[PDB]
């Protein structure tokens, strides 16, 4: 794995963690998943975690984090993966991402992207140039 990527993931890990313990909990991520315009219950909150959880404890630990990350870092057989990021980017649930919802998520995570950066990035998967990224456009970008 590229050191550059490692340093980048370091940033992500720094945003999910809010206790300084070094482990991803349900209470920490739940807070972010809340700022996304949603409100999940204990059943939903663990459902999301179970997706990453493979040990059976209900917590995003390091062992699962490595495998989980490898499952996306080199994801080119996107099955449920498409939906994951699609449901995180598509807040309206219409199936079309834009500088509308993307801006919100980019700011929610705390990445170094301005409003102009959002529109620019949006044209990476935007082939027709409609200002939105559809499922087809996303598939041919993530899987291909």
């Amino acid at each position: 794995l590229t050191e550059e990527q490692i340093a980048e993931f370091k940033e992500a890990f720094s945003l999910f963690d809010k206790d300084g313990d070094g482990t991803i909990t349900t209470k920490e991520l739940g807070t972010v998943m809340r700022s996304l315009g949603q409100n999940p219950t204990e059943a939903e909150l663990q459902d999301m975690i179970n997706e990453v959880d493979a040990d059976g404890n209900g917590t995003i630990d390091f062992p699962e984090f490595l495998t989980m990350m490898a499952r996306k870092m080199k994801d080119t057989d996107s099955e449920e993966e498409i939906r994951e990021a699609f449901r995180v980017f598509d807040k309206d649930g219409n199936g079309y991402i834009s500088a509308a919802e993307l801006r919100h998520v980019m700011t929610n995570l705390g990445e170094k992207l301005t409003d102009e950066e959002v529109d620019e990035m949006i044209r990476e998967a935007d082939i027709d140039g409609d200002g939105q990224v559809n499922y087809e456009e996303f598939v041919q970008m993530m899987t291909a």
Partner: peptide, 19 residues
């Protein structure tokens, strides 16, 4: 799901860095 969508977001945001 969550932390993984971040990895997906990073991949999608890393894919822009090409052309």
């Amino acid at each position: 799901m969550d932390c993984l969508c971040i990895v997906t977001t990073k991949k999608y945001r890393y894919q822009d860095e090409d052309t």
